[PDB]
Design a protein around this ligand. Structure first.
Ligand SMILES: Nc1ncnc2c1ncn2[C@@H]1O[C@H](COP(=O)(O)OP(=O)(O)OP(=O)(O)O)[C@@H](O)[C@H]1O
Ligand SMILES: Nc1ncnc2c1ncn2[C@@H]1O[C@H](COP(=O)(O)OP(=O)(O)OP(=O)(O)O)[C@@H](O)[C@H]1O
Ligand SMILES: Nc1ncnc2c1ncn2[C@@H]1O[C@H](COP(=O)(O)OP(=O)(O)O)[C@@H](O)[C@H]1O
Ligand SMILES: [Mg+2]
Ligand SMILES: [Mg+2]
Ligand SMILES: [Mg+2]
Ligand SMILES: [Zn+2]
Lengths: 403, 310, 418, 402
């Protein structure tokens, strides 16, 4: 929605040389120092324990929308995303020199006989594709939004006349039809830019293969670096395409246009790709990232990540009788009622805080968390019970978690 | 256009555009006119076309084909070029590059025939065999499409068939061999084939590019020729010798076939007009008939050179 | 409702300079929330001795004019207030010259002094709550009373946006997925002054075009809530299937912000509860269920039930009126009613109108038993379903209601007159 | 789209290739010894690049799959066959002796009548010849082609004539078994390589299927197209009723009558499509079918020179400060066991292992690290490589493209 002027930088990588698209991005940071760019927490929460009750109740409701503590598994994802963004522009180099004279001279010299062999221009091959599969509630959208928040979306090059759309986030068609995947693209191109496309390029007479070219005409005019397709699990049991027609679009789109495509899905979507070598070789184009709920213990010792994540959130309390230290029983109960799922942590803390504020006693104990789990978390009970059981097929009865 | 065919040797540019259409499969004439020109309000004609320059830009990469080459080597301009004049010829040449379709046909008084003279399509039976045995195609030729001679110079006679230019004014038609040519028995005189062969070399002559006399020059040349031949009295005419010269050289059947029947009984006659002062642009035939009847041992090129010398 | 804009600050830092949040009425504790909705009939002593016709009309006006908040009204009010005031954080109009800030940040991060920076402002989690419960349990009257506290339309002098805090839309008896947009237009052009339905909402445009225009109009005006009441009336056959209507309701999140409130019978629960995916997005801010008020939620009978029964008891207009209420009457009221607020007042008014009809001018338990055995034939399925407590017969008959009982009240008045 | 190169005429020594400019403006074919070094490519990998920081040094490792090619013993035969079928397909379209123009003149009947087999001249022959290319996915059917055809200038402009000779064109089928989208993709690929507008001119008029078939083939001869390459022919296996045979007949009438050679690339899943009939197979596979198989460890009781020359050559592209001078046989054995000879798995596995070795801290590549990377970042392709490893024909019968 905003256009940012570009300032050119230099990189020590010899493969990039002078590429405007690569050198207009933020500089190359190390992976270890890229985990502090995502951490955020509530501010001013230091002396808000004596104002009132409504204010202290409304402030706590903003914890899930402002608390983000990066884990040790975000370095790999950030590095893969950065490599995919920057390496998708080597083929599409806009600054071409005096190639005409060079090729003509080489052709004449190889025709005369002085040269034995000459090689002419060749098109860019297929670009890499990443597959991110993880259980629902592990933060597959918040992590992507916070990672991509460090890259400006639309950058305008003064010398050229192309708007570089660094990233673009859509969701799969809700009913699985190709025609609405082809339309969410046009819809999302309009909320990020200032022009209109829904009615100008939304002609209904184009077929799906014609829709390929219709979106190609705008994905090649722009410098689209990513196209992430969220919620890919909806493609399973669709209507328009029977066997593989859904991704028969994406394979051609990657082959011809060359924009890297990242697919975010649920372990239900594994069976879509794991059917044949032609499609599985492209789903895991640049490796496949598989996510699992946080484990309480690692090897023969308690996991440090779980302890750090719990103890960092524990200091955001707004109760008068807040406890500086955390007893092991509270942590054990919290993990038992959360089962390592990321979302069931912040919700179970915020609801307990609100219940404690409304009830009158300014403390949190095991009983209060147990009661709030028994009352407010009713629809989540069966799947957490399946996690507790641990049987592969018992978990496989439901199709939105690792089995 | 991406692949505009290179024109053959001695071919009308109309056939070049028709072959351009037949190469790329443009059946609809409107689409062809839009692609080649860009304006759908033009008129297609055989000989003396307009809107030139866009074709020369279509042939820009090949350095040889320019506007002058296409004007003087693939249209019927050489027939109308020397006789019309000098400044009028230059103005017409300058105007061919623009879109004034009616101006080319109107400014040239010889070309201002209003109603078309036999707007039907002509062809020659023997020439198609040679064209197929040499080039592999069939195309219109500037030898066939003389404005008033339906006779091939080398062979005996042409063969008309159905259709005409004015039947469809927005279409370009290309001749086809396997499409059965409407061959039917033909009989031709031997006194007009000679005239066609005499006029034919004027088409392909580099000297004619910069050779065009004026009206006063034409009058002086004709008066000098009449003085040399002795067919004139003291500031007068024999009034009969010029008649029997053309009568012996050409029979009455040929003259009535060409619509130049002698009317020596009446004062108004094309021969008498030529002998008198010249006030307009006489057609090529009115000069060629007199040239062949009076000076049989001189061709068109040296006749033009002698006329324009003084 | 056209109420102008007045801004009063609140102590929350996250709501620092949001004009839309501060234009709303000031934040209130539980006392004001539960005290601004209490309503009761005056029933002065002067009307006891008068004509029976006017008293009959006054009695018929009781169920509309009587209300008693139970122990979930405060929770619902707090949840709704948080939802309305938390859906503007990513849609606040307090956006200055951000271009200079973004340009300076980009320039500084390119020089190595600023290690990292954030370039996005679209920080607004999709907020929603699917508020469903038993039919007639107060999912419409109580919601009306809760939503009446907040003004519907607010006009700002400095800006030129008409903030629509809440909007409620109903479905036709047959129900369809297309009439929803038409109802939205027909409610908006009544709340506001315009001709949106005539100017843009024509019959030519398709359902997808309707949704696209709905998103744009919901972004033109600051819509803070979207209430769809009784989605049960929507047909599952004409719509297309049991998944595509769920799919349309899910697509109804594409509207920017606008936390939607979905209200329907428990028969629609099976549509959403199929996996943890929908058990997570559906209960974005928790799960709240509307249930009939039990007499004994704890060991002691609920103080709410006793207070409700007493307050309804002191609303009697009879020549021979007894102040004391028998415990047998309360037990019978529970047994016949099972805590449903729709039928408690209905049974009370029906019995106390039959008292006028017979001229007894008194209330007896036998009359209560007789009227229960007589009048409530269509609604028995739910009655024995609640008495037995089986949820299956409750849900399979939750779309049953007494058919046009206002007409029956009309002929009851006619019989009283005759 | 593609740079336009002026043509210069050499002297071909073949009697049949007497004066045809189309096969006189082409670059000459090299020898067998030079075909193994005219395609080889490698990364520069300056020896001073090992002292740089981890983040910079790890962004050049990811260039190995894109910038590494080793010509095997089959690319020579493929290049020779491509050259033969691209030079021998022009003898029937000599423009000098009035033969290209006869083909175009016969093309007006098809665009006017609609019947493709309407001959107007009986002295216009066709000698296009056809080829079929089948190999397991990930074996390099397209990366070999983009390096073999890279020696030809594609768009060559002749100045004595006015014809722009498109040496080769590469298109691909539609995701469904389309009938009109193929003819539209032809135009879409043709104008992009020429910078023209053919898709708008042909197609916006709402033509029929057969009329569009004639329009496509007429412009395929207006420009003297030499080789038509269609990628991923297995797409048409999902066609409608009659879509799995109509284009199989159209692709065997384009090469046999019209005169434009055609080459089709597809995974072994198209053998069922292409075995429908002998007259529908041999005509469309005149040269036969070129079958491609993964590299085998042992051929004649000794280690394969191809596998060794591939692995040992790839091993010298390591950006590790503690790299190994020599490659132990154990590392080679585990590398082949965890890749099963597929081209793509070897390079990708090496790159991922090197990246993880950088990320961890221990900068030495060992069989254990390869196994761990394989079990971590190659989840989707486990069962199929397992089936290839087992060698049981029953397992390979389903999927695995072999
Ligand atoms: N890295 C994190 N650290 C702390 N809390 C987190 C983190 N990631 C997510 N959360 C919390 O967990 C919630 C999970 O919601 P979120 O939208 O991220 O789910 P998801 O797993 O991406 O969803 P989906 O199933 O649609 O892919 C977030 O709203 C946030 O409150
Ligand atoms: N001979 C080879 N030497 C080195 N690398 C190779 C070789 N052949 C293929 N590769 C590599 O393996 C990968 C194959 O990519 P490519 O797109 O060509 O696959 P493909 O076999 O055509 O696939 P598909 O059959 O699915 O279309 C590329 O990374 C390429 O660099
Ligand atoms: N708190 C209440 N007290 C008394 N009557 C109520 C109460 N809530 C609802 N009702 C009765 O319910 C009827 C409306 O039912 P409604 O809430 O619309 O059901 P639904 O929401 O399932 O459509 C009204 O006629 C009203 O008399
Ligand atoms: Mg998510
Ligand atoms: Mg209701
Ligand atoms: Mg391929
Ligand atoms: Zn002739």
């Amino acid at each position: 929605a905003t256009r940012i002027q570009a300032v050119y930088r230099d990189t020590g990588v010899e493969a990039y040389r002078d590429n405007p698209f690569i050198e207009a991005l933020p500089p190359l940071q190390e992976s270890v120092n890229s985990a502090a760019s995502l951490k955020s927490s509530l501010q001013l929460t230091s002396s808000d324990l004596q104002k009132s009750r409504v204010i202290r109740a409304h402030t706590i409701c903003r914890i899930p929308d402002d608390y983000f503590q990066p884990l040790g598994t975000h370095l790999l994802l950030s590095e893969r995303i950065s490599v995919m963004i920057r390496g998708g522009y080597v083929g599409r180099n806009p600054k071409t020199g005096d190639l005409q004279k060079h090729l003509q001279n080489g052709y004449e010299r190889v025709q005369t006989g002085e040269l034995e062999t000459f090689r002419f221009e060749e098109a860019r091959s297929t670009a890499q594709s990443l597959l991110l599969i993880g259980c629902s509630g592990s933060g597959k959208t918040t992590s992507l939004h916070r990672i991509l928040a460090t890259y400006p979306q639309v950058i305008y090059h003064r010398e050229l006349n192309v708007e570089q759309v660094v990233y673009l986030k859509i969701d799969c068609s809700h009913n699985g039809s190709l025609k609405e995947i082809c339309l969410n693209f046009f819809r999302a191109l309009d909320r990020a830019l200032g022009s209109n496309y829904e009615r100008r390029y939304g002609l209904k007479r184009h077929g799906i293969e014609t829709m390929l070219a219709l979106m190609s005409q705008i994905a090649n005019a722009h410098a689209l670096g990513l196209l992430v397709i969220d919620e890919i699990q909806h493609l399973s049991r669709s209507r328009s395409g029977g066997s593989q027609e859904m991704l028969n679009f994406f394979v051609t789109m990657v082959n011809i246009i060359g924009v890297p495509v990242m697919l975010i899905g649920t372990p239900k979507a594994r069976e879509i790709f794991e059917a044949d070598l032609r499609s599985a070789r492209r789903g895991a184009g640049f490796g496949a990232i598989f996510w699992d709920p946080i484990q309480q213990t690692q090897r023969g010792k308690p996991n440090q990540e779980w302890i750090a994540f719990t103890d960092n959130l524990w200091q955001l309390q707004l109760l008068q009788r807040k406890d500086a230290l955390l007893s092991d029983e509270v942590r054990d109960v919290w993990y038992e009622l959360s089962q390592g799922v990321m979302d069931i942590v912040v919700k179970l803390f915020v609801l307990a805080q609100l219940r404690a504020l409304a009830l009158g006693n300014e403390r949190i104990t095991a009983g209060l968390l147990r009661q709030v789990y028994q009352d407010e978390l009713k629809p989540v009970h069966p799947m957490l019970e399946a996690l507790r059981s641990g049987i592969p097929e018992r978990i496989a009865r439901y199709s939105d978690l690792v089995v | 256009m991406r692949n505009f065919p290179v024109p053959y040797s001695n071919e009308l540019i109309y056939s070049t555009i028709a072959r351009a259409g037949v190469y790329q499969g443009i059946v609809s004439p409107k689409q062809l006119l839009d692609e080649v020109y860009g304006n759908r309000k033009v008129v297609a004609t055989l000989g003396l076309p307009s809107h030139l320059g866009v074709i020369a830009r279509h042939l820009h990469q090949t350095g040889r084909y320019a506007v002058q080459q296409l004007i003087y080597e693939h249209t019927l301009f050489p027939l109308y070029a020397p006789f019309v004049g000098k400044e009028r010829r230059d103005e017409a040449i300058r105007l061919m590059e623009y879109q004034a379709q009616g101006a080319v046909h109107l400014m040239l008084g010889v070309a201002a025939s209003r109603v078309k003279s036999d707007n039907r399509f002509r062809y020659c039976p023997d020439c198609v065999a040679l064209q197929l045995n040499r080039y592999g195609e069939a195309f219109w030729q500037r030898d066939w499409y003389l404005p008033a001679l339906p006779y091939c110079p080398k062979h005996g006679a042409l063969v008309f068939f159905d259709r005409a230019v004015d039947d469809h004014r927005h279409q370009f038609w290309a001749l086809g061999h396997t499409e059965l040519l409407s061959d039917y028995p033909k009989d031709s005189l031997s006194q007009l084939t000679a005239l066609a062969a005499y006029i034919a070399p004027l088409l392909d002559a580099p000297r004619a590019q910069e050779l065009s006399p004026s009206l006063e020059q034409w009058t002086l040349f004709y008066q000098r020729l009449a003085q040399d031949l002795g067919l004139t009295k003291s500031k007068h005419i024999r009034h009969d010798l010029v008649a029997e010269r053309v009568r012996q050289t050409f029979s009455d059947e040929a003259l009535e076939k060409l619509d130049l029947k002698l009317a020596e009984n009446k004062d108004t006659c094309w021969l008498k007009s030529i002998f008198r002062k010249h006030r307009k642009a006489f057609s090529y035939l009115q000069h060629s008939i007199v040239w062949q009847a009076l000076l049989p041992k001189l061709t068109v090129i040296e006749a033009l050179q002698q006329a324009s010398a003084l």
